[model samples]
Target chain A: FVNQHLCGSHLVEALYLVCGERGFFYTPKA
Target chain B: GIVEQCCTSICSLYQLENYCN
Candidate 1:
């Protein structure tokens, strides 16, 4: 089962961390 | 954990923005 956590700020941070070095190519566009 | 902002022209834009390589 995929239990997702709705952690406003923390969840985002966790994903960012898991993204790791792959994060270099990621840029949030507005 | 810290939520770092990359400087957008708006507030709460996080929900609107789509990030990609």
Candidate 2:
């Protein structure tokens, strides 16, 4: 897993969105 | 009834991340 878990933190999502790391996925998470 | 809470859901994310899957 490599400690990889993503969330829709808005901020984090924004970063990844601009960082060019496409395909980042998020679940509602509880 | 209630779902348990984490001090920070972000912390949960990290713990889950530490697992092997």
Candidate 3:
């Protein structure tokens, strides 16, 4: 079970926080 | 709780092919 909460302007940043540093590499190029 | 939702939103909007990587 995993629990996460996020509130921010940038969706990618919120995603990075949840997915960890690995997500930064996979961010959308657009 | 959020992992699934996170992947869902991102997948639906940005990249459906790569849900969570």
Candidate 4:
């Protein structure tokens, strides 16, 4: 079975962790 | 867990397509 854990706010919480601690960030061009 | 944040964000996006990507 293909199980996917969609990281919604988790993505935010993660990015927030990074952003909350960093002075810069980068997002990819999809 | 959350395999529903796309149909998801897209849903929220469509709510305000002008602001949606």
Off by over 4 Å in 3: A1-9, A24-30, B1-18
| Interface RMSD after interface superposition, model 4 | 12.1
Better of 1 and 2 by lDDT: 1
* First chain TM-score for all predictions: 0.42, 0.37, 0.35, 0.39
True-vs-predicted CA distance for residue A13, candidate 4, Å: 0.2
Q: Please, what are the lDDT tens digits per residue for candidate 1 over residues B1-21?
A: 112343222223343133312
Candidate 2 residues lying further than 4 Å off, grouped into runs, are: A1-8, A22-30, B1-21
Model 2, span A1-30: residue lDDT tens: 112333336424433443343433333353
> How would you order the candidates by lDDT, starting with the best?
3, 1, 2, 4
TM-score of chain B of each: 0.20, 0.30, 0.22, 0.19
As for candidate 4, its clashing pairs are: none
**Candidate 1 clashing pairs, residues 3+ apart or interchain:** none
Where does candidate 3 clash, by residue pair? none
* A1-30: candidate 3 lDDT, tens digit per residue: 122332233445555555564454333332
What's the lDDT for residue A27 in model 4?
31
Worst 10 residues of 2 chain A by lDDT: A1-10
Task: Write out fnat for all predictions, comma-separated.
Answer: 0.05, 0.00, 0.07, 0.00
Best by DockQ: 3
- The TM-scores, one per candidate, come to 0.31, 0.24, 0.29, 0.28
DockQ of each: 0.08, 0.08, 0.16, 0.05
